[PDB]
Design a protein around this ligand. Structure first.
Ligand SMILES: [Cl-]
Ligand SMILES: [Cl-]
Ligand SMILES: [Mg+2]
Ligand SMILES: [Mg+2]
Ligand SMILES: [Mg+2]
Ligand SMILES: [Mg+2]
Ligand SMILES: [Mg+2]
Ligand SMILES: [Mg+2]
Ligand SMILES: [Mg+2]
Ligand SMILES: [Mg+2]
Lengths: 279, 279
């Protein structure tokens, strides 16, 4: 059994050595070893794992919509002693004595427009067509998600780096054996092999995670010399009323009751943040 | 960045290894990883810690060259275009390439024509290198890892070796790193993820009997007498065949040069021989 822990937040990501801006047109997504045998080490209905999977799904949806190829790695059910090699010494039979647990988790189910690679080693590049698939498609950035952060995910990151591919480790779309091990993997990549980011940093229009983030969505929509206070009417500050239709439609994805009326009757940063907050 | 000495790991600092591959000299090779003036001079002149590190590597290379174990050096090239160096420029800046005078292996580990020097392009010794092939053709599937920096190049090489079906033996007191924590983490990583972690002394032939009890244990199986001698008993009276003293003196002459057949034979007792080994 593995025990759930608090997933890393923005402040838990150490400052990255490199600066690479995310380029959608140059990127691909990796969903690393998210098979049943591996997520079943947290047991049934683990909220930390449900959070991780939900984050990976968000990223995958964005990717598919934006023509960013999505790759999975899957460890094969049958592995001969010659092929498995030293992994038998390190982990024993692994998934090979639970072959029925080889499928990708239900909520991350591949379709035919994704690519599923047979995974033989920690690095998704080893004994696979991954490097050549990426170079041929003109993709030099790899978004990395899945389990387990410090082992296969971190190894693939370093390997990518060595192969001239820019890794983007996604802090809260990973899980590990332990929090310390998870956080070490982020410190390692941040300092030795690439970018470490939060899921929301790759998404083009995520819901405000803070009232500070909300101000950041609203402020460029106003015509003014002075910024408004949080309890100021936004329409007084140049907000086109029609913008609230798009805001409500975006924010309905979290709270099914938020419409134009709910926003319009009290158009303030204070009132809207209060609406987005409710559990 | 720059670097200060720290307390090198001892036997008790080594975390329990998952695997127990016995070292096999006939199947092994030695990697001396990136031990160039540039990297070592970050510790400053006459660093007592780095002097110990270099001394253990030197002891390992002497043992290897004497016992037909191939010795490999990885050395990063002076000449590195932006295309070849790639993302390492982003990560590290120019690295050694701005230092023509600091390119050679440290004086005390000077390679000879009977060793192999590999151009080191990436963290892993195996990348853009003939290392794996060189090893397979020589029937060598064990790789002794020594040098700098432990958690970066040496740890990646170990993991890459493991993935390429080569058994890494990370040498705890024959590595150095940016910090003690990163050094120790690399030991834990290999120990649970990729191979064996050992002390220099574990790979070298057994040293001169560390105790008189250790001496007695060497000797008792060479005796025929039903009963055990006192430390002052004549050992030839006890069934020791005198010829045995030749093989004993030769082994002890490696520490104390004066010990020959005459010196032992004139007084063949455990007491007297221990007095010789204890000076
Ligand atoms: Cl893994
Ligand atoms: Cl290194
Ligand atoms: Mg589309
Ligand atoms: Mg299923
Ligand atoms: Mg307020
Ligand atoms: Mg307006
Ligand atoms: Mg101590
Ligand atoms: Mg010899
Ligand atoms: Mg010199
Ligand atoms: Mg660990």
């Amino acid at each position: 059994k593995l025990q759930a822990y608090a997933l890393p937040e923005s402040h838990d990501i150490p400052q990255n050595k490199v600066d690479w801006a995310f380029e959608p047109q140059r990127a691909a997504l990796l969903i690393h070893d998210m098979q049943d045998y591996f997520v079943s080490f947290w047991g049934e209905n683990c909220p930390m794992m449900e959070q991780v999977i939900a984050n990976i799904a968000a990223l995958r949806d964005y990717c598919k919509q934006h023509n960013i190829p999505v790759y999975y790695t899957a460890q094969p059910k049958e592995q001969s002693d010659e092929d498995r090699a030293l992994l038998n010494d390190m982990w024993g039979p692994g998934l090979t004595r639970s072959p029925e647990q080889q499928k990708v988790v239900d909520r991350l189910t591949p379709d035919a427009d994704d690519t599923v690679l047979v995974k033989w080693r920690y690095s998704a590049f080893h004994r696979s067509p991954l490097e050549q698939m990426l170079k041929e498609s003109g993709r030099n950035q790899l978004i990395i998600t899945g389990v387990y952060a410090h082992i296969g995910c971190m190894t693939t990151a370093t390997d990518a780096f060595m192969r001239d591919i820019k890794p983007f480790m996604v802090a809260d779309a990973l899980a590990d054996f332990s929090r310390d091990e998870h956080l070490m993997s982020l410190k390692y990549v941040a300092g030795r092999s690439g970018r470490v980011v939060m899921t929301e940093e790759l998404l083009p229009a995520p819901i405000p995670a803070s009232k500070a983030a909300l101000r950041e969505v609203i402020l460029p929509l106003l015509d003014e010399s002075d910024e408004p206070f949080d309890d100021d009417n936004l329409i007084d500050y140049g907000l086109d009323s029609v913008r609230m239709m798009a805001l409500a439609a975006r924010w309905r994805k979290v709270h099914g009751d938020i419409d134009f009326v709910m926003l319009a009757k009290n158009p303030t940063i204070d009132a809207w943040w209060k609406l987005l907050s409710r559990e």
